[PDB]
Ligand binder design. Structure first.
Ligand SMILES: *CCC(=O)N1C[C@@H]2C(=O)N(C)c3cnc4c(F)c(-c5c(O)cccc5F)c(Cl)cc4c3N2C[C@H]1C
Ligand SMILES: Nc1nc2c(ncn2[C@@H]2O[C@H](COP(=O)(O)OP(=O)(O)O)[C@@H](O)[C@H]2O)c(=O)[nH]1
Ligand SMILES: [Mg+2]
Length: 170
């Protein structure tokens, strides 16, 4: 068949996980989507001439850490680690998400992409240079996105898939 990849979108409440994922699937910006609704979505994509089926989990639920998520997270093949460029706390939380991913996957080498969302807003408080410095330190790609304009959205998901395909060849 065509290969199938499980992708997981993680990050703090309100960063735009749902807006991103719905943009990629439904081709429109859905604002104020309920913060607690979780869903999976499927999408066929062609990347570098190979067609793949993406199964994308948009994480939600209660606004705390819960180990009830972790069996689900262990099924992820690649993760988008999303913060909002107008929200310093959401950037500060990225460390915790990467540590939990490494813990559940029991690996130092899990496909991941750092996503700085809401790039359309003028209210940036997270310096692109500091987020780039963090991504360099982790050894993972960094893409600034806007779910609203769609800037960066496809490149974030496609770069993740590329990282997964490379991982699977090691
Ligand atoms: C508005 C809800 C929302 O977007 N949330 C819910 C919660 C949340 O708010 N916090 C603080 C939270 C904390 N820690 C989380 C995780 F550690 C993980 C995670 C594992 O448990 C294991 C492996 C990878 C992980 F990323 C997840 Cl999936 C979610 C956590 C949350 N949520 C963030 C977000 C979905
Ligand atoms: N301007 C702007 N607002 C966004 C963007 N992404 C999400 N939002 C808004 O930020 C809020 C949270 O988005 P949501 O998708 O619910 O975040 P989630 O909790 O991470 O799933 C909503 O009010 C969205 O309309 C973005 O790229 N630009
Ligand atoms: Mg959401």
């Amino acid at each position: 068949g065509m290969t199938e990849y499980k992708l997981v979108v993680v990050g703090a409440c309100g960063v735009g996980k749902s807006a991103l994922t719905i943009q990629l699937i439904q081709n429109h910006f859905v604002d104020e989507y309920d913060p607690t609704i979780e869903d999976s979505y499927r999408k066929q994509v062609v990347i570098d001439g190979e067609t793949s089926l993406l199964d994308i989990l948009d994480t939600a639920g209660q606004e705390e850490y819960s180990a009830m998520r972790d069996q689900y997270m262990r099924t992820g093949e690649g993760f988008l680690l999303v913060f909002a460029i107008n929200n310093t706390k959401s950037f500060e939380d990225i460390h915790h998400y990467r540590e939990q991913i490494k813990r559940v996957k029991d690996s130092e080498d899990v496909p991941m992409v750092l996503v700085g969302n809401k790039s359309d807003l003028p209210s940036r408080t997270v310096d692109t240079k500091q987020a780039q410095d963090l991504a360099r330190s982790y050894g993972i790609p960094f893409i600034e996105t806007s779910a609203k304009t769609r800037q960066g959205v496809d490149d974030a998901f496609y770069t993740l898939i590329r990282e997964i395909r490379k991982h699977k060849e090691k």
